Amino acid sequence: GTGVLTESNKKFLPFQQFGRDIADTTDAVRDPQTLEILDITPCSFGGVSV
Amino acid sequence: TMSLGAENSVAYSNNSIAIPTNFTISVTTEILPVSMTKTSVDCTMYICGDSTECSNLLLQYGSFCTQLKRALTGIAVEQDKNTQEVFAQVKQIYKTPPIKYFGGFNFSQILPDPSKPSKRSPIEDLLFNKVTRDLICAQKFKGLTVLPPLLTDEMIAQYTSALLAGTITSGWTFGAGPALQIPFPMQMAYRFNGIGVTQNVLYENQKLIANQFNSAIGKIQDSLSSTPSALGKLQDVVNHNAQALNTLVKQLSSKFGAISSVLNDIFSRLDPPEAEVQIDRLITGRLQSLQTYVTQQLIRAAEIRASANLAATKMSECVLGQSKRVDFCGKGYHLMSFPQSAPHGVVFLHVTYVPAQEKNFTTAPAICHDGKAHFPREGVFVSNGTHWFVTQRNFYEPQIITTDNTFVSGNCDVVIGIVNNTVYDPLQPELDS
Amino acid sequence: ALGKLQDVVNHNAQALNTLVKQLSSKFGAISSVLNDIFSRLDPPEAEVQIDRLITGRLQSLQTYVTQQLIRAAEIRASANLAATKMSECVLGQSKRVDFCGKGYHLMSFPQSAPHGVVFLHVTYVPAQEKNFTTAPAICHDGKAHFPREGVFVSNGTHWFVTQRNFYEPQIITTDNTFVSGNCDVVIGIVNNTVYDP
Amino acid sequence: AGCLIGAEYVNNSYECDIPIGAGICASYQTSQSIIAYTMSLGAENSVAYSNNSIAIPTNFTISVTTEILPVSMTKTSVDCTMYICGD
């Protein structure tokens, strides 16, 4: 998927790898190689009105 | 088995009348939704989340993306019109006078308070502090955007403050032309003449009615704070919009005849000749799912539009004018109505006239003095047992029966219930002296 | 000026123009002309590919019917409001504020219009205001006199009683003032002479 | 609501012509260019409330206003046979 991988402060659990928001959307994933808590926010969108 | 109340069988007699002797001014609250959250969706991102192959099929599937976006656009313009036809009914924004002595009535709880930065009345402060990644940002990432209203929370508070300024200072002549300065003691003195009670009651019992009004307004803040389910009519609108958005985002994880809901996994775990068979199931189910949201939004908007038109009629007939419609402006004889802003709605404070302390008397249709039947001109014939008096129809005020409050019509032969009293002609004592 | 009567026509026009555009849009098929699918497929595949268009067109027609039902409900509410205004503004003098025009309702004249009715509400709007001095009641001979169907106004030197919507100075006679109580219960009462005719 | 790239913010308040969002309104006023102004709720009148003061009208202005309410609608009638199955 797409998004802006940023740093976060979520206190994950040892067995937890993925993440999810209130309603079915990945919000954070632990990096496989170097264990670290990231933040998945979708890339910038929006509506245009002329 | 539920009971419909207690038995209060009234003793209907042929010559028994009940005239009240005391008044009880009560301020009721009526809450009506005026607007809702202006929602807007994106067809491409919702149906095909970050899927270029899915987007290609959506264009060839039809132009259904334009009908839904145009339908939701009319809803957004509708909500801006609803807040424009109810709160915005006066051109000139009236301001409250510097002095706050309005005869003895304390409007400190309903007038805007300049101390707090929001510039809202203490009662409105309780309203906005009661009606309620997070859920809001989660819906945005799926296309469920919430457009901001045109009228801000400050402009709506200014529209309501202008109405309260014209209701106290101008009265009822600020929504039907230019505002006219009039004292508040003289304002309610003419609002009583619409319910039958003459103006010789407010001017006499001015301090008593002032204390009842000031005490009734204080109970409004207590009733809304003590009772948890008070602003429930406005929470139902918020909960319905929240449930509609929580259900529309829940159907995204529902397989409409497919192996999974992840559009990315379908293209990777299958092949294009086989993926096209199953990808048509989700693009049809999600498009039908979004169609149900627009359909339910149009039906729910009609329910709010009926409440917005009722609130517009209620704010024009109860606030800027006295309405003689029973039960329309609160339960009881309508006197005043003070509008107050609320999150997605308006809360009216209907000041009603509720009689109390009724007393039983004896009545007669007409009285006979010299053969001509004298009928009451504007009152009701009552009697305490020996003497007969003419009193008002909503407040006991014993008065002598002269020739100025009783007219004559016919003779005393056809009226069933005629009695024999003596009227006092106002010229006999003057001609004698 | 005639925006809503044109908006209701544009909504019925755009609904028919959208329904005819969905007719030439393949709802997941090989083509859009039904008379060509039966000449480019065998009956086995014809029954399969034609259902994907019939179902889509039936769903579009049901969506159109639902939109028409909602619009008909809205127009029925509008027609009920217009009939209520016709029975109150035209067939009488309604006292509901803002209902029959912006002001004091006097009369109304309905005019025919395409798919609607144009009401000509004649309203009473005051103008040319003037500030005076008022009092709740006046005292004379120890007893208080209250206005009957007017307001006690004063031009600075004399006191008169006028109407509540139009200035008409009249002397304070003992025919337009009723007596109730003494002059020690009303806060704001002034002193004057109630001349008796 | 968002970023309005193309207009300029003028401090003078005018009547709303093109609604933008959260009080912002656009218009093409004086070379003339598209501007963005805070929506004005009206004028600022102040009624002089006094204990002894009344404003009795002296003249009248009979005015005629017009309201436009829809009544009927084009009675559409579709054909299930020809629309679904065209010839």
Coordinates of N, CA and C in Angstrom, one line a residue, chain D residues 3-48:
Chain D
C3 N -7.0 25.3 1.6 CA -6.2 26.4 1.1 C -6.9 27.0 -0.2
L4 N -7.1 28.3 -0.1 CA -7.8 29.0 -1.3 C -6.7 29.7 -2.0
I5 N -6.1 29.0 -3.1 CA -5.1 29.5 -3.9 C -5.7 30.2 -5.1
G6 N -5.7 31.5 -5.1 CA -6.2 32.2 -6.3 C -6.9 33.5 -5.9
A7 N -7.3 33.6 -4.6 CA -8.0 34.8 -4.1 C -7.2 35.5 -3.0
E8 N -7.6 36.7 -2.7 CA -7.0 37.5 -1.7 C -8.0 37.8 -0.6
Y9 N -7.5 37.9 0.7 CA -8.4 38.1 1.8 C -8.5 39.6 2.1
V10 N -9.7 40.1 2.0 CA -10.0 41.5 2.2 C -10.7 41.6 3.6
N11 N -10.3 42.6 4.4 CA -10.9 42.8 5.7 C -12.3 43.4 5.7
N12 N -12.7 44.0 4.6 CA -14.0 44.6 4.5 C -15.1 43.4 4.4
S13 N -16.1 43.5 5.1 CA -17.2 42.5 5.1 C -18.3 42.8 4.1
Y14 N -18.7 41.9 3.3 CA -19.7 42.0 2.4 C -20.7 40.9 2.5
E15 N -21.8 41.0 1.7 CA -22.8 39.9 1.6 C -22.2 38.7 0.9
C16 N -22.6 37.5 1.3 CA -22.1 36.3 0.8 C -22.7 36.0 -0.6
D17 N -21.8 35.9 -1.6 CA -22.3 35.6 -3.0 C -21.9 34.1 -3.3
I18 N -20.6 33.8 -3.2 CA -20.1 32.4 -3.4 C -19.7 31.8 -2.1
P19 N -20.5 30.9 -1.6 CA -20.1 30.3 -0.3 C -18.8 29.4 -0.4
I20 N -17.9 29.7 0.5 CA -16.6 28.9 0.5 C -16.6 28.0 1.7
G21 N -16.7 28.5 2.9 CA -16.7 27.6 4.1 C -16.2 28.3 5.4
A22 N -16.9 28.1 6.5 CA -16.6 28.7 7.8 C -16.5 30.2 7.7
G23 N -17.5 30.8 7.2 CA -17.6 32.2 7.1 C -17.0 32.9 5.8
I24 N -16.1 32.1 5.2 CA -15.4 32.7 4.0 C -16.4 32.7 2.8
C25 N -16.4 33.8 2.1 CA -17.2 34.0 1.0 C -16.4 34.7 -0.1
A26 N -16.7 34.4 -1.4 CA -15.9 34.9 -2.5 C -16.9 35.7 -3.4
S27 N -16.2 36.7 -4.1 CA -17.0 37.5 -5.0 C -15.9 38.1 -6.0
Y28 N -16.5 38.7 -7.1 CA -15.6 39.3 -8.1 C -15.9 40.8 -8.1
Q29 N -15.2 41.5 -7.3 CA -15.3 42.9 -7.1 C -14.0 43.7 -7.4
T30 N -14.1 45.0 -7.4 CA -12.9 45.8 -7.7 C -12.0 45.9 -6.4
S31 N -8.0 46.6 -12.0 CA -8.5 45.3 -12.4 C -9.2 44.5 -11.3
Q32 N -10.4 44.1 -11.6 CA -11.2 43.3 -10.6 C -10.7 41.9 -10.5
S33 N -10.6 41.3 -9.3 CA -10.1 40.0 -9.1 C -11.0 39.3 -8.0
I34 N -10.9 38.0 -8.0 CA -11.7 37.2 -7.0 C -11.1 37.5 -5.6
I35 N -12.0 37.9 -4.7 CA -11.6 38.2 -3.3 C -12.2 37.2 -2.4
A36 N -11.8 37.2 -1.1 CA -12.3 36.4 -0.1 C -12.5 37.2 1.2
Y37 N -13.7 37.2 1.7 CA -14.1 38.1 2.8 C -14.9 37.3 3.8
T38 N -14.9 37.7 5.0 CA -15.7 37.2 6.1 C -17.1 37.5 5.9
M39 N -18.0 36.6 5.9 CA -19.5 36.8 5.7 C -20.0 37.7 6.8
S40 N -20.6 38.8 6.3 CA -21.3 39.8 7.2 C -22.7 39.3 7.5
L41 N -23.0 39.2 8.8 CA -24.4 38.8 9.2 C -25.4 39.9 9.1
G42 N -25.0 41.1 8.7 CA -25.9 42.2 8.5 C -25.3 43.5 9.1
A43 N -26.1 44.5 9.3 CA -25.7 45.8 9.9 C -25.6 45.6 11.4
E44 N -25.2 46.7 12.1 CA -25.1 46.7 13.6 C -25.9 47.8 14.1
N45 N -27.2 47.5 14.3 CA -28.2 48.4 14.9 C -28.3 48.2 16.4
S46 N -28.5 49.3 17.1 CA -28.6 49.2 18.6 C -29.9 50.0 19.1
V47 N -30.9 49.2 19.5 CA -32.1 49.8 20.0 C -31.8 50.4 21.3
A48 N -32.3 51.7 21.5 CA -32.1 52.4 22.7 C -33.2 52.0 23.7

